[PDB]
Amino acid sequence: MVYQVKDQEDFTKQLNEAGNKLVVIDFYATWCGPCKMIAPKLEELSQSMSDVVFLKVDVDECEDIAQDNQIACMPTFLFMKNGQKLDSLSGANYDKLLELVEKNK
Amino acid sequence: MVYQVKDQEDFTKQLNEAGNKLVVIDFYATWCGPCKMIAPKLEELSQSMSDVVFLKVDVDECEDIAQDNQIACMPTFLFMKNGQKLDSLSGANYDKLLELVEKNK
């Protein structure tokens, strides 16, 4: 599953429940074509990879979280572990997403 | 001064108000750092140039307009003249912007 982050403290709650697991966060908008195209692939990946936590942040609903992470393109995938940033990817390139999750998991 | 488009009808009103002038529309968000960096440069070009009209669209306030224009990064600049799309530029590349303004005005 891909869990939808509700607000700043909810994002922190999720980053903790992840324990030591890689967390992949998709920053998206509902008006954005490339975001809608890749969303189902992220959902398929999340059902299989139970040792990675997948989250999503709607930038219109969570403008403060978007500003905290310096988002400018969408989708942007942020890679985190233990509350700390590992890597980011801008755009819907599913092979680069898979490479980054392989690298970081 | 850069005018903020309020809604789809207002976009048509301003396209009509521009007459035969090139129109540059900055699709931006208030949480987006590169947009904030370039906004004062746009205000300076808007006060400087009398043969170009500068508009802005807040993607979180006009999500419909952003969808219809296939926005995915920000800022994105659309270049229009007599209702026609001439060019677009993704990102806060001020030199490219000025080059597309000089080419199309």
TrEMBL record, chains A, B:
Gene3D superfamilies: Glutaredoxin
GO molecular function annotation: metal ion binding; protein-disulfide reductase activity
The family this protein is said to belong to: Belongs to the thioredoxin family.
PROSITE patterns: THIOREDOXIN_1, THIOREDOXIN_2
Keywords tagged on the record: Disulfide bond, Electron transport, Metal-binding, Redox-active center, Transport, Zinc
Domain Thioredoxin, chain residue ranges per copy: 1-105
Pfam families listed in its UniProt record: Thioredoxin (PF00085)
Active site: C32, C35
Disulphides: C32-C35, C32-C35
PANTHER family: THIOREDOXIN-LIKE PROTEIN 1
Recorded coiled-coil stretches: none
CDD domains found in the cross-reference section: TRX_family
Source organism of this protein record: Penaeus vannamei
UniProt name for this protein: Thioredoxin
Deprotonates C-terminal active site Cys, annotated site positions: D26
Residues at the site labelled Contributes to redox potential value: G33, P34
Residue sites binding Zn(2+) per the record: D60, E63
